[PDB]
Design a protein around this ligand. Structure first.
Ligand SMILES: Nc1ncnc2c1ncn2[C@@H]1O[C@H](COP(=O)(O)OP(=O)(O)NP(=O)(O)O)[C@@H](O)[C@H]1O
Ligand SMILES: [Mg+2]
Length: 304
């Protein structure tokens, strides 16, 4: 059945890293851009540091350790990298810096510069990340474009594991949830597929809000009626049909992530045949400071 989990959790000295700038604040906590110098190693690693609200209420500490636990246990090019934790008054989470931020803000900001090749490659990459999670039997439960990060315009990774669970275990983003999850709190790899559909639609509409202005309470009814998100203007029926499949009532009738990898990948070989974007053919998409000889991306920093 279940193999032992031998992932290493790395605990990092507060002195090994400098904060440098705030990236995001308010709500629950703060995320900083920083550099990490492991002890005596002659490398500087750009990182994000997730130190929650100074309020150290035990409830919050247990949630961040759940994240660390999940992120320490994954290892895939399309899933966010945990570097370690820092155990100061409140627990800091240290991840690979994803310089271009979250994919939702990135599509919203760069609408006029995003071609079909990038859209379809992101779909392929997110499907790969999700398939890997499926191999490790994790159900993410919060896939959305706000939970995908951008290392470069050509390289994205799934983030936010603070609701992830194993398939089976029993232990609220309404507009991204499969109907069986809104109704019965059932969560499967196939409910993740539903959310993949929504995430794709967010990308294809360059950041629109699904069911914009429709209160959450209505959502389950609308879905039961048989209503779904509408076809984005740039989408051929080929792409939109993939979305709609991800939104079938019968969970087992939805595609598997491995099929999504395959379909989007065929599409990515001829992107203009599948997404129709004004000016596509002409679209195109310088690091830290001065002492940057020793900088190494996390993806090139490997640990025995
Ligand atoms: N590894 C990272 N690299 C760069 N920016 C990041 C990173 N992690 C988080 N951020 C920034 O911080 C924002 C919020 O991070 P995150 O902690 O995921 O959001 P939150 O609202 O605190 N809760 P959630 O989004 O549900 O995790 C993201 O949209 C990014 O803009
Ligand atoms: Mg969170």
């Amino acid at each position: 059945g279940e193999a032992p989990n031998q992932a290493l959790l790395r605990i990092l000295k507060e002195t090994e890293f400098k904060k440098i700038k705030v990236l995001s604040s308010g709500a629950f906590g703060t995320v900083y851009k920083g550099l990490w110098i492991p002890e005596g190693e002659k490398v500087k690693i750009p990182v994000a540091i997730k130190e929650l609200r100074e309020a150290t209420s035990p409830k919050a500490n247990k949630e961040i350790l759940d994240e660390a636990y999940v992120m320490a246990s994954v290892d895939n090019p399309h899933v966010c990298r945990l570097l370690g934790i820092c155990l100061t008054s409140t627990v800091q989470l240290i991840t690979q810096l994803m310089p271009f931020g979250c994919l939702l803000d990135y599509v919203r900001e760069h609408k006029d510069n995003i071609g079909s090749q990038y859209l379809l490659n992101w779909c392929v990459q997110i499907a790969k990340g999700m398939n890997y999670l499926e191999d490790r039997r994790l159900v993410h439960r919060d896939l959305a474009a706000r939970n995908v990060l951008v290392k470069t315009p050509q390289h994205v990774k799934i983030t936010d594991f603070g609701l992830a669970k194993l398939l089976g275990a029993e232990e609220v983003p309404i507009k991204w949830m499969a109907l069986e999850s809104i109704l019965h709190r059932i969560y499967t790899h196939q409910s993740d597929v539903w959310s993949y559909g929504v995430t794709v639609w967010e990308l294809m509409t360059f950041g629109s809000k699904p069911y914009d202005g429709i209160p959450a309470s209505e959502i389950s009814s609308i879905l039961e009626k048989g209503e779904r998100l509408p076809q984005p203007p740039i989408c051929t029926i080929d792409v939109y049909m993939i979305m709609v499949k991800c939104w079938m009532i019968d969970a087992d009738s939805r595609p598997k992530f491995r099929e999504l990898i395959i379909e989007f990948s065929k599409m990515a070989r001829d992107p203009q045949r599948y997404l129709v974007i004004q000016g596509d053919e002409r679209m195109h998409l310088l690091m830290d400071e001065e002492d940057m000889d020793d900088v190494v991306d996390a993806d090139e920093y490997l640990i025995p």
